Design a protein around this ligand. Structure first.
Ligand SMILES: Nc1ncnc2c1ncn2[C@@H]1O[C@H](COP(=O)(O)OP(=O)(O)OP(=O)(O)O)[C@@H](O)[C@H]1O
Ligand SMILES: Nc1ncnc2c1ncn2[C@@H]1O[C@H](COP(=O)(O)OP(=O)(O)OP(=O)(O)O)[C@@H](O)[C@H]1O
Ligand SMILES: [Mg+2]
Ligand SMILES: [Mg+2]
Length: 1145
């Protein structure tokens, strides 16, 4: 795209752009300007006039440097902020369909890490390039007078290399787009790895994920190596061509000296102007590289942005009528998911409801009830149907007004990482704490909210990870109530709610059911006992209908179901000791590179000396041709050396960066679950941290490091040529060097300080946005997108200003340093005039030293341009090094310990007292004791949030026990090798996590370190009562499951997880609420399958069905960390304990 990074000017941006361009023009063209005056060289009088001219040019140089840097960087910051804001606004704008079809996992790394370069390369370097252009131009103008004839020759080289830059730019643009796509894929893989890090650490599947990340990284490294070798070879060949054109012009001048067309002075001035143009191109060399990278990233970003979605999330066209009744109309609604447009989910179903009438939808698993609820939500438009509310077409009314006039409760709701206060406030724009308290009371959330510390300040973990399932469901119910809408959409609202809790919630909802057009769905007949209208589900059709009495008399699906129920400075380099010889070759190439920089002056002096040595013109021409040949040979060696140097730097840097990213992933996986629990160490937080750290580390360690080393060798050899030639003059130029070096320390310190905090704010924005994308479904449900955008805008407020400040600081520093160098050059000229009057040193030697310092001058300035990159890289490398250095409490990769191959299947917990890292103030464990023998299917029961999941997690060794001892067959869990057991046992989490992979792939994840057999997968799926449905599904087992299994109905996911656990065939199984939401027939099938393999594998069972726990060998009660009763199901049944009370309710 042309101006791909600009789509709005206004007076403001238009004037900013104009002024930046004009000021840079003065800068670039100003470079060959002071050069012309130098070439133009009573002798003392002219020396003073020229030195004063040099001082004036230097003062203007400071002025222009600051003006351009600052103004163009201010405009660039405005543009970058506008780009990010528009990107996020559109990202929210898109319809659900694009998110479903596309793998949103990339955006998290692409939203941040790329956006960085999108503006970075498209701003900082840009002014330079602009200025450089004028330079060449003015430099050519310099030669226009300096032997106009010879000047036309170089003119030919201008486009000869000009078109070359454009071509290399486009090629690198394609290469960078490919690299970015690969990087986005790697980031999506890492993000998905992070979010379910729990399960991944559970199954010990670390190796496979690590290999996947290394694979994406290797592909990216190959793409980068191609691009970087290309760019370095481009530099080398360009250098060779510049030297060749110079040699041709040298032969031309040799001819012209005898030709009499021009004097030697004019030709030398033309040669100086040509070398100035050479410096301009060398400056633009990297300026064209960033231009291209940014062009590719901007193409991609705006292409993602430009999409206008059909279900617009902001349009106000839709009507929002005042008088609305609780009447809905569904007719001939036939629709299918866009993840798989073939499968028909809606078979032309039709429904009806009335305000205050609660319509219950009960059917078979996968009936599409969640689909019906989402369709009501208008999240996706139906394929065919006239779904309308209160007569008016759903598409007719305003989308925002409708969505705000609706509430929904998800089957497995996800809680953002805030405090319950903020989560609830998300329910409505304006909520009174009186409303909050009323809602919490309605949802039974007051009990736990009060009991735990931070009553409303309790910051919930990611996705509500820090609270047990019951609490999350209560909080979600409270959120929905807080919405206080005219049409509620509770769906499977009771999943783990305690019988007392479930009854209380249902009674409260009914108490307020009068005004609400709710649509209840639930698997417990108690919840649908009072359902006003009960409808069955059968292949996308509704048959059984009417009152519960009507269905019971019909002996329909409802009747059958009812009956069935019955710091970093050099350590970063130190780590890269593997690249020792690539670095060595780079160093040798750069060494000669530097010497060459100021060596050009020695060549010019020798050329003049040959021209003025002998009067005879035959010998003169012979010597001139010999000099031209020597220059061409040196140019060939130089082209070779520069490309070898560039290749060495690029390859070593890419190797280092890939190694760093891979090792960081290895450690991040090797860290502890608690470290993930760390809010600062969040999922999106971890991903963005990794991406930005690696990106900055390379961006310093990349070709820029090579250019800085070359400038250091260049300016270095420059000052060196002065010492040999001049004495008592270059000493001044060098004694001043440290003065400018002092301004660099200040700049570096200030930039590092600014960057730490600005990057912290950027990472905060990244975690916020990552959560926004990952739970985009809930956000759509709550229509809280605008608040998300505002929070992101505020996040952007910090480093927007921070970068404005850093741009001002860098501009001032650069302008002051350049002007100081120009003042030093004018002063060296003045010292030379004084010395000439003293007549102690050769005037031509002074000319050579002045020219050599001018040659090193471009090098010095550009190295001045490495300050903020170097600081950012130091900071990023510090963070990465620290992250790698950590060795966790339980190290996954550390195999030291034992290995009880003779597993006796004997579990014993004694005085097990333990608390959560986020719930240390919340005593979760009190030292309860339990014992399980071989094939003992122990079941634990207790009140909501009785820590039940905590016993399972602790058995996971996810967290060691504050007090007590958990052994295994008479062996402490700590003593044995953790990996042996972690693979050995299997568990089924209460809200299981999938991976956006084939169902076959997910299941195969059930066992790792062993190739899964399609026969084994078939057997497990059959055992799970999901083989039939999966076969009914197209793509058999290769079906690509949505994000976190976002495409399979809840029973589907739970059955798949159970199959995964059974596949592991472990001696110890853990079923946390194993029938969270499944058909009673499905529950029976699962229980029968589990029983059929009961013997030989000890089991722990958790669920909220009396029948499910009835078969449990020994039931265990939970009472505030105390086991009140422990015995048979019949023992508790005979006893009038709380088990019996709950069973009754
Ligand atoms: N996002 C999706 N993309 C594609 N197919 C989907 C998606 N969500 C669900 N499906 C398919 O549609 C079937 C029915 O949809 P849905 O999950 O809404 O039904 P349900 O009756 O609420 O489910 P259940 O009671 O099993 O949880 C699911 O079993 C799955 O096969
Ligand atoms: N990650 C966590 N960090 C801190 N505290 C936690 C965490 N997970 C759970 N807790 C605390 O421990 C309690 C017990 O939750 P857990 O899921 O372990 O048991 P549970 O009672 O079986 O769950 P449920 O509420 O689904 O019945 C939670 O209610 C909460 O107070
Ligand atoms: Mg469902
Ligand atoms: Mg639980």
């Amino acid at each position: 795209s042309v101006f791909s990074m600009f789509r709005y000017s206004n007076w403001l941006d238009k004037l900013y752009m104009v002024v930046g361009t004009l000021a840079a023009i003065i800068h670039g063209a100003g470079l060959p300007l002071m050069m012309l005056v130098f070439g133009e060289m009573n002798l003392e009088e002219d020396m003073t006039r020229y030195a004063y001219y040099y001082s004036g040019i230097g003062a203007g140089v400071l002025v222009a440097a600051y003006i351009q840097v600052s103004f163009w960087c201010l405009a660039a910051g405005r543009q970058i902020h506008k780009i990010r804001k528009q990107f996020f606004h559109a990202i929210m704008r898109q319809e659900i369909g694009w998110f479903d079809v596309h793998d949103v996992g990339e955006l998290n790394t692409r939203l941040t890490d790329d956006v960085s370069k999108i503006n970075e390369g498209i701003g900082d370097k840009i002014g330079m390039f602009f200025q450089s252009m004028a330079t060449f131009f003015t430099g050519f103008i310099v030669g226009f007078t300096r032997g106009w004839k010879l000047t036309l020759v170089i003119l030919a080289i201008s486009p000869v290399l000009g078109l070359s830059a454009a071509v290399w730019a486009k090629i690198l643009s394609s290469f960078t787009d490919k690299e970015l796509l690969a990087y986005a894929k790697a980031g999506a893989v890492a993000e998905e790895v992070l979010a379910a890090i729990r399960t991944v650490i559970a199954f010990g599947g670390q190796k496979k994920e690590l290999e996947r990340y290394n694979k994406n990284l290797e592909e990216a490294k190959r793409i980068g190596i191609k691009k970087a070798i290309t760019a370095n070879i481009s530099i080398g060949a360009a250098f060779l061509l510049i030297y060749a054109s110079y040699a041709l012009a040298f032969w031309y001048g040799t001819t012209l000296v005898l030709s009499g067309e021009y004097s030697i002075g004019q030709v030398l001035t033309v040669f100086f102007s040509v070398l100035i143009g050479a410096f301009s191109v060398g400056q633009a060399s990297p300026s064209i590289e960033a231009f291209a990278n940014a062009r590719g990233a901007a193409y991609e970003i705006f292409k993602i942005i430009d999409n206008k979605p059909s279900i617009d999330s902001y349009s106000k066209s839709g009507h929002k009528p005042d008088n609305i009744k609780g009447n809905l109309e569904f007719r001939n609604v036939h629709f299918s998911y866009p993840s798989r447009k073939e499968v028909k989910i809606l078979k032309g179903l039709n429904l009806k409801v009335q305000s205050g009438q609660t319509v219950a939808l009960v059917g078979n698993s996968g009936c599409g009830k969640s689909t019906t609820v989402q369709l009501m939500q208008r999240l996706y438009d139906p394929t065919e149907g006239m779904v309308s509310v209160d007569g008016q077409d759903i598409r007719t009314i305003n989308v925002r007004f409708l969505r705000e006039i609706i509430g929904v409760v998800s089957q497995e709701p996800v809680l953002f990482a805030t405090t319950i206060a903020e989560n609830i406030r998300y329910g409505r724009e304006n909520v009174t704490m009186d409303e909050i308290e009323k809602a919490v009371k309605e949802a039974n959330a007051y009990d736990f909210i009060m009991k735990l510390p931070h009553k409303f300040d309790t910051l919930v973990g990611e996705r509500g990870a820090q609270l047990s399932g019951g609490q999350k469901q209560r909080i979600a119910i409270a959120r929905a109530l807080v919405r206080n809408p005219k049409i509620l959409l509770l769906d499977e609202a009771t999943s783990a709610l305690d019988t007392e809790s479930e009854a209380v919630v249902q009674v409260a909802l009914d108490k307020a059911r009068k005004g609400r057009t709710t649509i209840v769905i639930a698997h417990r007949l108690s919840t649908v006992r009072n359902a006003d209208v009960i409808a069955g589900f059968d292949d996308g059709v509704i048959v059984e209908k009417g009152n519960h009495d009507e269905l019971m008399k019909e002996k329909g699906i409802y009747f059958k179901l009812v009956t069935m129920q019955t710091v970093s400075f050099w350590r970063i380099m130190k780590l890269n000791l593997t690249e020792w010889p690539y670095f060595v070759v780079g160093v040798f190439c750069a060494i000669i590179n530097g010497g060459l920089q100021p060596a050009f002056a020695i060549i010019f002096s020798k050329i003049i000396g040959v021209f003025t040595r002998i009067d005879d013109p035959e010998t003169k021409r012979q010597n001139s041709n010999l000099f031209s040949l020597l220059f061409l040979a040196l140019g060939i060696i130089s082209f070779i050396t520069f490309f070898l140097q560039g290749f060495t730097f690029g390859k070593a840097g890419e190797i280092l960066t890939k190694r760093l990213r891979y090792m960081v992933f290895r450690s991040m996986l090797r860290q502890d679950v608690s470290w993930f629990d760390d809010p600062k160490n969040t999922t999106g937080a971890l991903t963005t941290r990794l991406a930005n750290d690696a990106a900055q580390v390379k961006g310093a360690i990349g070709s820029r490091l090579a250019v800085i080393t070359q400038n250091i060798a260049n300016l270095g050899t420059g000052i060196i040529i002065s010492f040999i030639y001049g004495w008592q003059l270059t000493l001044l130029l060098l004694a001043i060097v440290p003065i400018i070096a002092i301004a660099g320390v200040v700049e570096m310190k200030m930039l590092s300080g600014q960057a730490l905090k600005d990057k912290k704010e950027l990472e905060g924005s990244g975690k916020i946005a990552t959560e926004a994308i990952e739970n985009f479904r809930t956000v759509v449900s709550l229509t809280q997108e605008q608040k998300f955008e505002h929070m992101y805008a505020q996040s952007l407020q910090v480093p927007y200003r921070n970068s404005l400040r850093k741009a001002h600081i860098f501009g001032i520093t650069f302008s002051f340093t350049q002007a100081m160098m120009y003042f030093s050059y004018a002063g060296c000229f003045r010292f030379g005039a004084y010395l000439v009057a003293h007549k102690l040193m050769s005037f031509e030697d002074v000319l050579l030293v002045f020219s050599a310092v001018v040659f090193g001058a471009m090098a010095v300035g550009q190295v001045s341009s490495f300050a903020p990159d170097y600081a950012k890289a130091k900071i990023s490398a510090a963070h990465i090094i620290m992250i790698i250095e950590k060795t966790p409490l339980i190290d996954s990769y550390s195999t030291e310990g034992l290995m009880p191959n003779t597993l006796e299947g004997n579990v014993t917990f004694g005085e097990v007292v333990f608390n959560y890292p986020t719930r240390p103030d919340i005593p979760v464990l009190q030292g309860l004791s339990l014992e399980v023998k071989k094939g003992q299917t122990l079941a634990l029961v207790g009140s909501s949030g009785c820590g039940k999941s905590t016993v399972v997690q602790l058995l996971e060794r996810f967290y060691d026990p504050l007090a007590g001892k958990v052994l295994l067959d008479g062996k402490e869990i700590k003593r044995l090798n953790v990996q042996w057991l972690r693979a050995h046992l299997g568990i089924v989490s209460q809200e299981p996590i999938l991976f956006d992979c084939s169902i076959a792939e997910n299941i195969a994840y059930g066992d790792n370190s062993r190739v899964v057999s399609q026969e084994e997968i078939v057997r497990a799926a059959k055992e799970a009562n999901i083989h039939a449905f999966i076969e009914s599904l197209p793509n058999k087992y290769s079906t690509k499951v949505g994000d976190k299994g976002t495409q399979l109905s809840g029973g589907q996911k739970q059955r798949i997880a159970i199959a995964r656990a059974l596949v592991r065939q472990p001696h110890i199984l853990l079923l946390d609420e194993a029938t969270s939401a499944l058909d009673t027939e499905s529950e029976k099938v699962v229980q029968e399958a589990l029983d059929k393999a009961r013997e030989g594998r000890t089991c722990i069972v958790i669920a909220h069905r009396l029948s499910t726990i009835q078969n449990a060998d020994l039931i265990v009660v939970f009472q505030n960390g105390r086991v009140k009763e422990h015995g048979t199901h019949q023992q508790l049944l005979a006893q009038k304990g709380i088990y019996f009370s709950m069973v009754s309710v």
